[PDB]
Symmetry: D2
Subunit: 114 residues, 4 copies
């Protein structure tokens, strides 16, 4: 299945935060309604934050995360969870190699804000 794609409510503020856990430098692309609106680049093997931004979901509410390392696409896994019928998390893991830890870049999207 396609992974890393989430339908948010339209025209809604959300947070996006990326963490790195790999020898490789991670490149995280954030697309809103099929346009790149943020790119995070960084390297850590200890969960450093390589980007954190507030964005708007735009007319369609479509948010897509893509992860690569020097142009090679990582394999993605994702899901959305809703707590108390109101608090939303859209969660992404990614794998750049063969160990299947899926933490090489970790992306957390949260809404609502405020």
């Amino acid at each position: 299945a396609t992974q890393g794609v989430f339908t948010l409510p339209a025209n809604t503020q959300f947070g996006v935060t990326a963490f790195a856990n790999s020898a490789g430098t991670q490149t995280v692309n954030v697309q809103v309604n099929n346009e790149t609106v943020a790119t995070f680049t960084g390297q850590s093997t200890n969960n450093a934050i390589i980007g954190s931004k507030v964005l708007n979901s735009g007319g369609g509410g479509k948010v897509q995360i893509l992860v690569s390392v020097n142009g090679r696409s990582s394999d993605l896994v994702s899901a959305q969870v809703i707590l108390a019928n109101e608090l939303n998390f859209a969660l992404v893991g990614s794998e750049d190699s063969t160990d299947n830890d899926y933490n090489d870049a970790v992306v957390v999207i949260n809404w609502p804000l405020g």
Copy 2:
């Protein structure tokens, strides 16, 4: 039900990150095996990160999150999700008032690291 308590594997490094979305200053207490090991404090209505740390789950693996505002306990909600049978997220929302957005302090725990 008790919320904000998670059993991690023993002796495991994990990340903990807190976000704020409230008029009130949030205090996030992190306990590992019933001992406070981190306290994050901050105020934001726009998802500022008020703390991010790497911790070890120790012998027992017990991690607990408590959220308060000037000593008054917020109401908590939580769940754990596992992707690809390997990537773990432990998630907490909290509510300090009556609007039930549950985002007043948001806490994300992730493992494995590295």
Copy 3:
């Protein structure tokens, strides 16, 4: 927080299935837009299905699950999870006593159907 309350897409078919794991006979009440539309009763300590029905979420999309054992309300836990940005589960556990296994009645709501 209130637990067992989910906003589904309006006017949408969904499944509801309940399982029992307790000495006590479980009563599961399903409300759609504040009206009881299904009641499941049964006893099992081995996960027997005590009911499964297809319902419509109606104009408001509100679905609420209540669980009781001989007239006493059980304590509820819940969350919603979305896979592949399409497949939805609303999940409820319940506890009728002191052991906090939260499996005494387990309810799974799934959509879309068809």
Copy 4:
């Protein structure tokens, strides 16, 4: 990523339940520690239960779900969710065609029992 593989606690009773939502007859294969221990076969476009069984996770705790329709493997999506640090759901959707509803066979695994 590999999907439909879960590490359960070892030597633990669990429930597995399959639902069908497709024109095609679904065949669900359940493996515990790499041995087939159940096969569910059935057809429904309205969420009928095509199998429900209690199984044990054995020494290794490994559970794998595979879905096929008339010999063609369906595409899988999955995740695990834990409520109240105790109640576990391992969730699988599957897609047998082109519409990407991922509900063609839905598989729910739940533990603990009893």
